[PDB]
Symmetry: C4
């Protein structure tokens, strides 16, 4: 595999069509899904030349851990849909690559099993039925050694996925929510923040005022994100709001971005627009579907090579230098 696109072809071969569609699809007309890619393709980097590259490093420090790349595996529910080893295959490859893995509330293997793989994981939270029950999931995650709570804040309910409706898609009986919902509010965020000393990361922020309020609320990070085009159809891509958000929070929390990251060059673009790190969702699942744990290992090795290549060609010996690169919008 020499690009992330090789793995999508491989995953489309192997998966049942309705599972490929569950993975690939967005809500509505998929305008926001498409716009995530169009928005990244319009961004051009202005590289710097002739800088010292003797010790290029792609490492970052985030939420009190060193990560090998400015990247984490996005939360993706029900990974046994894609491969029998599901979350354990992905988490093992992420650990070995030095990349944080986000354990999902809707994981198809229990969060304690996935956390036992090691690799200092994160835990993604959907607000439940109940404050008390939500907080038990948080405490479970913390007790199991998760290092951050990624609170998803853009899913008061799930978006309308027309592919899934047209397919009549439902979980196979062999895929269950192994850890076993009400709309979250800022009060829910405060309840979580009071319940844990782990950093709380709010995933699904797009409005500048919501990024500022996240800082004021004591979030340790946000993920600027339209949920891969799966929630509001017509929501702006995160990458289009990232620069304005980074300026507004003025270093008050980590600012991650996701949606359409498909190469180390895209990682570089996100960094140059100010992101602390990116999440990568669908490509990780393509690699899982294509070749299990080894597939995800090859994907993360390929991304690491592409990030290092892009950084050095742009004159950046560190991710901090990459955040100081300038960009130019072009027409595609």
């Amino acid at each position: 595999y020499v690009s992330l696109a090789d793995l999508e072809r491989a995953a489309r071969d192997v998966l049942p069509g309705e599972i490929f569609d569950f993975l690939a699809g967005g809500s509505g007309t998929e305008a926001s899904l498409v716009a995530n890619r169009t928005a990244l393709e319009r961004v051009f980097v202005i590289p710097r030349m002739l800088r010292d590259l003797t010790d290029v490093t792609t490492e970052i420090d985030i939420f009190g851990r060193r990560a090998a790349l400015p990247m984490a595996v996005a939360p993706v529910a029900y990974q046994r849909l894609f491969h029998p080893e599901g979350e354990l295959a992905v988490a093992r490859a992420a650990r070995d690559a030095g990349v944080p893995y986000t354990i999902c509330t809707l994981s198809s293997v229990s969060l304690e099993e996935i956390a036992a793989v090691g690799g200092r994981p994160w835990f993604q939270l959907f607000w439940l039925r109940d404050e008390k029950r939500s907080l038990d999931l948080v405490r479970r995650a913390e007790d199991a050694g998760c290092e951050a709570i990624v609170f998803t804040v853009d899913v008061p309910w799930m978006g309308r996925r027309l592919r899934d409706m047209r397919n009549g898609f439902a979980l196979p009986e062999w895929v269950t929510a192994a850890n076993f919902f009400a709309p979250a509010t800022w009060e829910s965020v405060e309840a979580v923040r009071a319940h844990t000393d782990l950093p709380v990361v709010l995933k699904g922020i797009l409005a500048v005022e919501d990024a500022r309020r996240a800082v004021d609320a004591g979030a340790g990070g946000i993920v600027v994100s339209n949920h891969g085009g799966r929630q509001l159809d017509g929501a702006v891509p995160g990458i289009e709001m990232l620069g304005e958000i980074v300026a507004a929070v003025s270093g008050g929390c980590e600012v991650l971005v996701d949606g359409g990251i498909r190469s180390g060059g895209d990682v570089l673009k996100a960094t140059a627009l100010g992101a602390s790190a990116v999440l990568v969702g669908r490509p990780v699942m393509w690699a899982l579907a294509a070749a299990g744990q080894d597939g995800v290992r090859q994907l993360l090795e390929l991304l690491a090579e592409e990030v290092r290549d892009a950084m050095g060609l742009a004159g950046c010996e560190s991710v901090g230098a990459a955040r100081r690169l300038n960009t130019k919008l072009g027409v595609v």
Copy 2:
């Protein structure tokens, strides 16, 4: 049906080609027809998160009536072209859905029959031959219980519909103007305003100065509209003028928009740009053609679900909140 586009396919199947073309077509090269869709597709919404959604409501108050959605059925002439029950099927479904229905001057069932369906309808006026005759239509509508006069102001004469010319299209002998024209001016508006206490809504405004003059003229609303691309070919889409118009009228009248609204997400975009409500034309006729009254019921149920979904995913418990959303223009 899971999208408005499913119904267009169904209507294209059933209608004679020349009737489908009468419905689908625009004037000239159909530049303005296409631009209505392109303009909406360029608009992205910036959703808000973590707001209270305990009692999301899509209702609005407009022209002294509560409506179930920020939407009305646009005036579309000669609806017996599309289904034998014509206007009565549409008006019955609109009533049952709580959505205003606009009775046309060129309806193929008399306005008194359609008004007897109930549902507090509106009446669309074309200026006639004569001030005295125009005012009789207005008084008829008011006597029959119509609640607003939608005065069409963009049709001094009808635009040049090349599909209809190429088809040699004419009304079947079984379709007639059951209520039975000179260019309207601001004097005509004043004559109507003096003749009725119903709110007068000027449909087909695109220039900012004309929206201000409509307020000064005592209009209770305007519809920002290029008539579905059927009048001047090369007229700007209403959605491109809406924000400037809303700012100029500064709450002095209701500001509706139409042209290309094809989902609850599009309704949300129009609201976020400042519209009080939208009109929907061709999709209602697709549903009528596809399945009569039941077809229109299913369309309005689908739109209601999509509007509620879009509002809540954008953090809006009310249409007023949706009007306070910000938008971003993207490239598509």
Copy 3:
């Protein structure tokens, strides 16, 4: 025929391919030829409503003559390439329609014969070999009753037409320059201006400073024009420079535009951007090829209908009102 595009199809049927290419083609990669259309398609008009349309007139006064439309037939060399009656067929139809016809220096019928058709024609000048010889052509035109000299200023030599090179195109032996070249300069303009009291119109101006200098030089008009994409490939379309030029000349001369005008709506766009009138080139030749004089008559009747339709739908009772319309750039 219900659009200018119907006539292009008809002309492509009848003409030899290499003659169709001589007519249709541009220089280089035809970037400027294509851009003339793209530039017009991006322009949207903001129509006004509810104005008095009791006496809509498309007439203008230009160069001391009333014209029926804000339009003239562009200079197109060698019209016997397209039909045996050549220039005489076109000039007769233009006369009957009340539209100025531009007699070409390279006409395939002598300028005195074409002028004898009547209709108060204009004469297009290419600068010759010699000041004395150029001025004799001017005097010939004036003696024959031409009413303006259209001095082409964008052809120091002819552009590189790759279609013609690939075809090995040359004039049939039955087509000759019946009136029988050095680069023109501002000194040439002054020599012409001193030799005639007819208005001198400089055709092929694109730079704002050249439009101002044309006024200072005593031009009575300019044509803002990239010569139909046939001269510099990569020259900006005239329609993209028109508004800036109209503002710069501040009424000091007539400002015409050409390039890609293909409907009455396009005429309206050019007027709304400030043009006094347009020229139309290739469509006139399509109609000539398709059906001789009668073909050109039908084209001019169709354009007249489309101009009147567009003006009235935009609320303009006169071309002056149309010049006061505002426009909005859109994306197509």
Copy 4:
């Protein structure tokens, strides 16, 4: 051949596919390769009219030599891949055309042999293993009569060429680096500048601050360039940074540009944006592949004709006049 595109078709016919791909390809998704063309196609020139064209000249003075055109042959490694005479065929044609030829560090004929062809060549430097060894290459070039050192500064290592990876491409055993690498820094530039009195030209500058620093470093020129889309994928095209760079250096060094120049009109656009001259890479190799030395001669004759045509149609008797032309960005 009437356009550069004719030669690409001819080269694609004759070359082995994997050699055509080595030549044609870029890094990554080839976004920057494509953007070089898209960026040029968006630029329109505003031509001037009626200027004296009695002695149009395309000559420039650069690095102390008169050149016949504002153009040089770009450095392209391993030209025996494309034709058996390789660099000698190209250098002979360049000499005969009066166009500088850039001898590559990775030439497949030794730099002394190519320099013996004559024509006052330039020498392109890749920084080596060692300061001492790099400086020996520079001194070799100077001793052989090269007139400028083109130091490539955008290749700390080579970009990831996916076509070459997919093809498993490697040099034929009959193609070698006949002159026989560490990342260059500003210290390397200073070492070169101190070692030679020849002008040092830094090739691969895109950031404005790097262009200013190049002047401060004593560069005699820069080439604003993303290396033909072969280095960082997502690097901005040089033509998009050229105007800002020309303004920033304020005449302190020559500013060349490359990437996608495919006609004399493109040369004119680059000049109008402020370039001193352009480099042309792939088209020269197409002509070499198609027809050896004679092929390159025909290409350079065609470019010379197109540059002279474009200049005169734009009213420029000299390249200096062309740099004073204004441009307008359009949509394509």
